[PDB]
Amino acid sequence: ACDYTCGSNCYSSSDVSTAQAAGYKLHEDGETVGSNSYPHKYNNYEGFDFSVSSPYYEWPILSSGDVYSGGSPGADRVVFNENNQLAGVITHTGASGNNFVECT
Numbered sequence: 495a496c497d498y499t500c501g502s503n504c505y506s507s508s509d510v511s512t513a514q515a516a517g518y519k520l521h522e523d524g525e526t527v528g529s530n531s532y533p534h535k536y537n538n539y540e541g542f543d544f545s546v547s548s549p550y551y552e553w554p555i556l557s558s559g560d561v562y563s564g565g566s567p568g569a570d571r572v573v574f575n576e577n578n579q580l581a582g583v584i585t586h587t588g589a590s591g592n593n594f595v596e597c598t
C-alpha cells in the first residue's frame with residue numbers, strides 16, 4: 495500500500511524522508527538546484543491545514559526514486575518547515591493550472 499498517493503504515483507514513508515533530507519540539507523546550506531531554484535518558499539495559497547508551523551519550503555519528490563538534481567521536477571512535492579518537520583506531500587496532478595492538491 496502507498497503511504498502517499500499523488501495521482502498514479504506511489505510513495506512510501508522512506509521515499510518521503512529521503513527526499514525531505516536532501517531538500518533540507520540544501521536549505522541549511524543556502525543552496526538551490528534546478529532552473530526553478532529548489533528548495534524554495536511555499537506560500538500555501540491553497541490554504542492547507544498543516545499541523546506544523548511555517549515557513550514552509552517545497553522540494554520535488556520523484557516517482558523514479560531518485561533525489562532531485564535538476565531538470566523537470568515532475569508534479570509532486572514534499573513540503574517541510576524550518577525545523578525539518580514534514581508538513582505534507584502535495585501534487586499538481588488533479589489540480590487546475592499550477593495549483594496543488596494533497597496526496598492521499
Ligand SMILES: Nc1nc2c(ncn2[C@@H]2O[C@H](CO)[C@@H](OP(=O)(O)O)[C@H]2O)c(=O)[nH]1
Binds near residue numbers: 530
Ligand atoms: N500554487 C502555488 N504555487 C506556489 C506557492 N508558493 C510558491 N509557489 C510557486 O509558484 C509556482 C506554482 O507552480 C511555483 O514556482 P516555480 O515554478 O518557480 O517552481 C511554485 O513554487 C503556493 O502556495 N501555491
Ligand SMILES: [Ca+2]
Binds near residue numbers: 505509
Ligand atoms: Ca519508492
